Write a protein that binds this ligand. Structure first.
Ligand SMILES: C[C@H](C(=O)Nc1nc2ccccc2[nH]1)N1Cc2ccccc2C1=O
Lengths: 325, 248, 826
């Protein structure tokens, strides 16, 4: 049946190209020989066998088969390299995780700069991302690695979230030890820079806010190389962490250690004054220092900016393709 | 969409193990021993109860597709526990599972791991994942035992006695093929039903519908008493075969 | 890692901007011409211009304006670079010693901001109280010009109007006042604000808004006696000042967009206007003095003067001399006469300043059998289109071949003693239903001519409505003789067929040498073309013969000869064609993992692909199997302008952000993934837009090898006309030259005090990286021009490596000989 994963062979896909590099293997674009639909194939290599099947792939297989949303990538199946070995120890064949292929990634479109996104596009884009994150956050999963490179967009205009390699279940009732740094520095929230270790789902909200600003400037907001320089840039815009705005900042391991140059005042509304009012308020709420005062995914959907956005008729991305030559 | 993981009791007469000449009693023994091995090893390593159960469910499912004569149980159990650790985010190094498996197993038993214990285990991971058809997410009776108990209101001490006795029954049910016969939600209800009869408590009184004598129907729809009795009979048969009496 | 060297062979020739004032002395009239990164200073004479000084800056000159604040004797110069380096400069001369003073400097980049569509705008107050900068949407930046602001510190005023077209400071206002045209959903408007340095905010402006033309493009600040402003559009010119409103809409200007404006009479009575067809107009302000004595504006008049080059900037200078600064064609000095000549023109050309203009393509060919090699470039656009023949002889000798139409591609066919050139000319929908060309040009002045009669797309059943007056491109293949450069033949492609690629080669076992052209059917409705042709021509006996045509389902952006086979890129697809004994193209194999396969280069069986956004991919033809295989891909997102193969392992690319980079195979294939990754090992900010990379050298070397340290030779053309050269180094030679750069940068004084390391750092809005793997040869070659004290200071404690002597100290005289050898590669 369609449920018997891990037995079909990769012979069923004509390999087209190398779309990307992944943590457990390289990602390839392929075409299904039987249906013609284009897929994306992630090669999971267990041959290194340092610790067997990679845990990052296990997270992506466990979570993405449980989560089905228009804005989260669909894992179609898992296929094996070849059953020829005939002996289990001799077999080193890799496994491939099949996904629906996506034409473009958010970083790629911005980095080339060919695409200029209107407010209406941004509304359509952000509503999809937050609706997807709401589905995951409601099912008690945390992405923990939300960057532009992990936001896929097809030419139709549908957005899907994809890299769940670091995704883990979150329990509010039971405090659990976690990883100290999960999100990429540019999109990492301030608490994780100060080493919270017990992070809330509001970590992903901060990243999505960094994207919201980025879509209006076409340049990432907080670009740094080191964790302290990043906290300084955030502080120049959002204000320095202090008990006045984040009563529990004192409980964080590096609060006394990682002080910014000054105790800066918040200027977010000044430096982003060129943004529409409905959008600027969303940015201000998402980019709140105290994760317990930072808005939730649902709250973003119930905002003046995204609430009335009808996704039935969505504006397609203006990914230009003539006169660029 | 999702694979089907439940068989009829009558179907267990046709496992690969049975058709290779193993009798029903022996396969049952091999299952109890393999499940208890997974439980004991993981408990020594400090693993969460879900992690132990996930390994055991992988184990029980595995021997619906393979024979105990061709795949040694103690190796399979160790492999299941190793994989379960990664699925449930309580990971352990394979060498550490072997170390514990050696501590608890005698030399004849540890002979199944062959000349290279770690290698025999890691190699089986491919066969395990393909066998379980890559469906790694598993739900267990525990979460339902608690979800349903939270909706009971009454004597704090009588309910806590119900929960602990039922929790013990869930632990015992992992040594059986009930994991393969009924969804975990039904198991949680059955163990609540069993504990209730044993403690002479009338659970309907603790529900929001105190005059609804079939109290479980609000937790699990479409479950006949036939099923809850069948499950109870199987758990109690374990206690009637072993020296240990009902916990009470 | 990789080591490469980049030098300028021809400096930028395009005029980006020009201003006139009193910069060198309060007495002389100066003309400051801006070419990319280059400032030329002239002094106006009665015959022409006397050059006095030229400097380079470590930046692209974006804003150039001359101002004289109270207390100064002469004008000061403000320059802002495209990386937001600001400075104020002063000319100082001590007898024979001329130097440029950096009076104030700083970088005005904001951490957060959206770069504006209409680009950086810079203006200065008539009372020189402040400098206005429009860098980002929704923000107006003010640098107040106080004596103490040596760092050019500034503040931003929130601007409600996000989309601003143009802004100027106004004359005759009680406070510093800005007048600007902005665009919102309702249309375009003109609006004013007052600028308060004390409050650091805008106040209500002196006069009300007016709704202006939808394509209002430029704002003209008119001095007293008039005051107010003039707004130039596509169809109309309007004057605004409080209650006064005038509008003239003469039909002559509707024909061609007006792009530049200059003031002739300091009082504002006369203004010069230029349009994209080269026409030069005079805009007249007709005065009327009232009984009160107040001077008002009675009417506006527009009079056609004549034809110049398509001008980026206009400067009136003195008498009848006007400087036509062109980016698309040769710049000019022209004289305006009071009396028209017998053709009706008041404009007569004086001097012509060579501009290589846009270099769309180029090839190196040894026409005279000299072993040297000469560069034939496709240069210019529209009526300025020309071929340029460039040979070394100490200056470069350039011959100009006018075409009067846009050249697109060039390739040399030796067997035929001629060049093939793709060109496009503008015709306009006329009342016959057909089109009419605005002027005769190369494709219409060919000796013999032909028109494609292909029936491939004659299926029609497609609506393509035509309105009178709309422009269309008409594309041609030109056969041009290599000695006379006479247009021997012109072949016109189909209606709406754009010629994109051109090769000259033999294929298969066919002894004939063919011209092969790849085209694309372009209809305005189509976002991306979906039809196209590969056409095989044979030029024989003065006639071009259509040999074979292959229909393709896309645009043929690039083609290249590949071991007797034809390699072609059709939209996403990269295809290999074979030439059968039936003289038809037959597909062998395809590659589909591309967004847009814009650029192709080959070496052996290896192919380098350049993509619209996916950077570069190395593809190999596998002859045992008859298909392609992906060797390695660059996964950093880059928008490509041109690519080139340096050697079997190093690959050179150019980015649309004026950056260069070099990718290499990892060459350490422990894992498949490592080999499949192409690592960017060189990064360099050129400052120019590279259209074409071409292997070859202009240096005259026959049967002689001096074993220059540099190995290899790649020439490249740019949009601003700069011709550069990339070559490789050994690790030893790089380290020497790199260590020397760091020493030179501490010694050499930069105009505006711009750090050299900052200038050459790889820069996109999103990424800024330090340069790597590249030696700025233009910096190395400046060692020969620094004074002796500075030379010796540079060589102090300088050691060589991996040489005959492992460690060897350098003297000033040793480096002078080395640099002189390095100046011999161009
Ligand atoms: C956007 C597209 C891609 O990787 N899509 C994708 N869909 C996916 C679906 C599931 C998982 C991973 C996926 N990855 N890219 C990026 C790129 C860079 C360089 C060369 C080619 C390509 C290319 O095709």
């Amino acid at each position: 049946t369609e449920s018997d994963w891990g037995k079909r062979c990769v012979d069923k896909f004509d390999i087209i190209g190398i779309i990307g590099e992944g943590t457990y293997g390289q990602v390839y674009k392929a075409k299904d020989k039987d249906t013609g639909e284009l897929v994306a194939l992630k090669k999971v290599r267990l041959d290194n066998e340092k610790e067997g099947f990679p845990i990052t792939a296990i997270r992506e297989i466990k979570i993405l088969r449980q989560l089905i949303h228009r804005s989260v990538v669909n894992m179609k199946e898992i296929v094996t390299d070849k059953q020829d070995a005939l002996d289990f120890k001799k077999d080193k064949g890799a496994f491939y995780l099949v996904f629906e292929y996506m034409d473009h990634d958010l970083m790629g479109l911005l980095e080339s700069g060919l695409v200029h996104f209107s407010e209406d596009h941004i509304k359509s884009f952000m509503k999809q991302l937050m609706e997807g994150l709401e589905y995951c956050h409601k099912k008690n999963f945390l992405h923990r690695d939300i960057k532009c490179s992990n936001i896929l967009l097809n030419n139709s205009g549908q957005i899907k979230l994809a890299d769940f390699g670091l995704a883990r279940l979150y329990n509010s009732e039971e405090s659990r030890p976690y990883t100290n740094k999960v999100i990429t520095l540019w999109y990492r929230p301030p608490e994780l820079l100060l080493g919270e270790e017990r992070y809330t789902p509001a970590i992903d909200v901060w990243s999505c806010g960094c994207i919201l600003g980025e879509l209006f400037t076409k340049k990432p907001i907080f670009q740094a190389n080191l964790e302290l320089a990043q906290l300084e840039l955030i502080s120049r815009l959002c204000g320095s962490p202090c008990p006045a705005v984040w009563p529990d900042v004192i409980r964080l391991p590096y609060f006394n250690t990682m002080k910014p140059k000054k105790q800066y005042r918040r200027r977010l509304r000044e430096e982003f004054s060129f943004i529409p009012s409905a959008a600027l308020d969303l940015l201000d709420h998402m980019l709140t220092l105290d994760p317990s005062k930072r808005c939730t995914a649902e709250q973003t959907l119930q905002s003046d900016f995204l609430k009335d956005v009808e996704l039935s008729k969505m504006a397609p991305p203006d990914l230009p393709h003539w006169q660029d030559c | 969409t999702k694979p089907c993981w439940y068989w009829d009791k009558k179907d267990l007469a046709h496992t690969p193990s049975q058709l290779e000449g193993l009798d029903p009693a022996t396969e049952a023994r091999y299952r109890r021993e393999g499940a208890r091995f997974i439980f004991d090893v993981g408990t020594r390593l400090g693993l969460h109860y879900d992690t132990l159960a996930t390994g055991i469910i992988y184990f029980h499912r595995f021997y619906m597709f393979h024979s105990f004569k061709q795949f040694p149980r103690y190796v399979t159990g160790a492999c299941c526990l190793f994989l379960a650790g990664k699925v449930e985010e309580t990971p352990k190094k394979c060498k550490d599972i072997i170390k514990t498996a050696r501590s608890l197993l005698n030399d004849v038993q540890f002979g199944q791991f062959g000349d290279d214990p770690k290698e025999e285990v890691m190699v089986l991971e491919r066969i395990l994942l393909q066998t379980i058809k890559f469906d790694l997410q598993v739900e267990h009776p525990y979460q339902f035992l608690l979800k349903y108990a939270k909706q009971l209101k009454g004597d704090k001490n009588k309910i806590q006695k119900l929960v602990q006795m039922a929790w013990t029954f869930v632990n015992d049910s992992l040594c059986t093929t009930l994991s393969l016969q009924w969804e975990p939600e039904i198991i949680a209800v059955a163990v609540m039903y069993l504990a209730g009869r044993l403690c002479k408590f009338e659970i309907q009184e603790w529900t929001s519908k105190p005059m609804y004598r079939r109290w479980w129907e609000q937790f699990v729809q479409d479950v006949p008493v036939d099923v809850l009795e069948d499950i109870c009979h199987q758990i109690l048969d374990l206690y009637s075969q072993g020296k240990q009496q009902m916990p009470h | 890692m990789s080591y490469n060297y980049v030098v300028t062979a021809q400096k930028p020739t395009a005029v980006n901007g020009c201003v006139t004032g009193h910069f060198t002395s309060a007495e002389d009239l100066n003309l400051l011409i801006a070419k990319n990164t280059r400032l030329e200073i002239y002094v106006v004479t009665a015959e022409g211009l006397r050059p006095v000084k030229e400097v380079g800056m470590y930046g692209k000159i974006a804003v150039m304006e001359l101002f004289r604040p109270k207390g100064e004797s002469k004008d000061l110069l403000f320059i802002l670079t495209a990386k937001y380096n600001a400075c104020i400069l002063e000319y100082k001369q001590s007898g024979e010693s001329i130097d440029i003073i950096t009076r104030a400097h700083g970088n005005v980049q904001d951490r957060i901001g959206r770069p504006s569509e209409t680009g950086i705008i810079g203006i200065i107050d008539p009372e020189c109280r402040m400098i206005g900068l429009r860098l980002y949407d929704g923000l107006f930046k003010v640098i107040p010009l106080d004596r103490d602001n040596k760092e050019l510190k500034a503040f931003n005023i929130r601007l409600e109007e996000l989309h601003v077209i143009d802004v100027k400071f106004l004359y005759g206002c009680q406070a510093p006042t800005i007048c600007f045209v902005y665009q919102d959903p309702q249309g375009r408007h003109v609006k004013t604000y007052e600028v308060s340095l004390r409050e650091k905010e805008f106040n209500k402006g002196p006069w009300k808004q007016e709704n202006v033309e939808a394509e209002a493009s430029m704002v003209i600040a008119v001095p007293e006696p008039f005051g107010g402003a003039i707004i130039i559009g596509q169809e109309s010119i309007t004057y605004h000042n409080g209650d006064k409103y005038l509008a003239i809409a003469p039909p002559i200007i509707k024909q061609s967009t007006i792009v530049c404006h200059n003031r002739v009479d300091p009082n504002g009575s006369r203004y010069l206007l230029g349009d994209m067809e080269g026409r030069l107009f005079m805009l007249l302000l007709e005065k009327e003095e009232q009984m009160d004595g107040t001077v008002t504006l009675k009417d506006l008049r527009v009079e056609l003067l004549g034809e110049t080059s398509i001008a980026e900037c206009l400067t009136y200078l003195d008498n009848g001399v006007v400087f036509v600064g062109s980016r698309l064609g040769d710049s000019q000095l022209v004289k305006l006469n009071v009396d028209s000549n017998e053709q009706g023109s008041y404009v007569v050309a004086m001097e012509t300043f060579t501009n290589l203009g846009p270099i769309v393509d180029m090839c190196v060919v040894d026409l005279e059998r000299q072993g040297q090699g000469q560069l034939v470039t496709c240069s210019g656009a529209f009526k300025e289109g020309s071929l340029r023949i460039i040979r070394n002889g100490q200056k470069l000798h350039i011959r100009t071949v006018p075409l009067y139409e846009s050249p697109r591609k060039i390739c040399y066919q030796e067997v035929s003693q001629c060049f093939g050139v793709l060109s496009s000319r503008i015709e306009v929908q006329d009342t016959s239903g057909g089109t009419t060309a605005l002027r005769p040009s190369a494709s219409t002045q060919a000796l013999s001519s032909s028109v494609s009669s292909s029936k491939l797309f004659s299926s029609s059943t497609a609506p393509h409505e035509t309105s009178f007056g709309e422009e269309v491109e008409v594309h041609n293949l030109l056969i041009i003789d290599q000695h006379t450069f006479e247009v021997l033949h012109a072949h016109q492609f189909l209606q709406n067929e754009y010629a994109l690629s051109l090769v000259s080669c033999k294929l298969g076992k066919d002894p004939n040498t063919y011209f092969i052209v790849g085209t694309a059917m372009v209809y305005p409705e189509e976002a991306e073309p979906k039809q196209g042709r590969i056409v095989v021509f044979q030029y024989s006996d003065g006639k071009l013969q259509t040999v074979a045509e292959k229909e393709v389902k896309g645009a043929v952006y690039s083609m290249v000869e590949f071991n007797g086979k034809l390699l072609a890129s059709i939209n996403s697809t990269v295809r290999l064609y074979e030439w059968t004994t039936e003289k038809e193209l037959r597909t062998e194999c395809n590659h589909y993992n591309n967004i847009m396969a814009l650029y192709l280069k080959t070496k052996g069986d290896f192919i380098l692909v350049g993509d619209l956004m996916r950077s570069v991919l190395l593809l190999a033809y596998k002859p045992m199997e008859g298909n392609f295989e992906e060797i390695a891909r660059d996964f950093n997102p880059n928008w490509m302008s041109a690519v080139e193969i340096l050697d079997d392992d190093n690959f050179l690319g150019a980015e649309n952000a004026f950056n260069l980079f070099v990718c290499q195979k990892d060459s350490a294939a422990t894992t498949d993934e490592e080999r499949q990754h192409l690592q960017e090992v060189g990064l360099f900010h050129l400052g120019e837009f590279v259209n074409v990379f071409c292997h070859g050298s202009l240096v005259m070397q026959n049967l002689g090898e001096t074993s220059t340290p540099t190995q290899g030779s790649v020439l490249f053309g740019t949009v601003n006309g700069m011709i550069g050269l990339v070559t490789s180094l050994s690790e030893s030679w790089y380290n020497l030259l790199l260590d020397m750069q760091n020493r030179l940068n501490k010694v050499i004084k930069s105009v505006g005090k711009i750090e050299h390391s900052f200038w050459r750092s790889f820069h996109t809005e999103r990424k800024t990286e330090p340069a790597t793997g590249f030696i700025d040869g233009d910096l190395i070659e400046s060692f020969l021009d620094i004074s002796r004290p500075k030379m010796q200071e540079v060589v102090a404690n300088l050691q060589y490596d991996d040489g005959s002597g492992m460690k060897r100290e350098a003297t000033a005289d040793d480096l002078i000989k080395v640099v002189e050898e390095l100046t011999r590669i161009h």
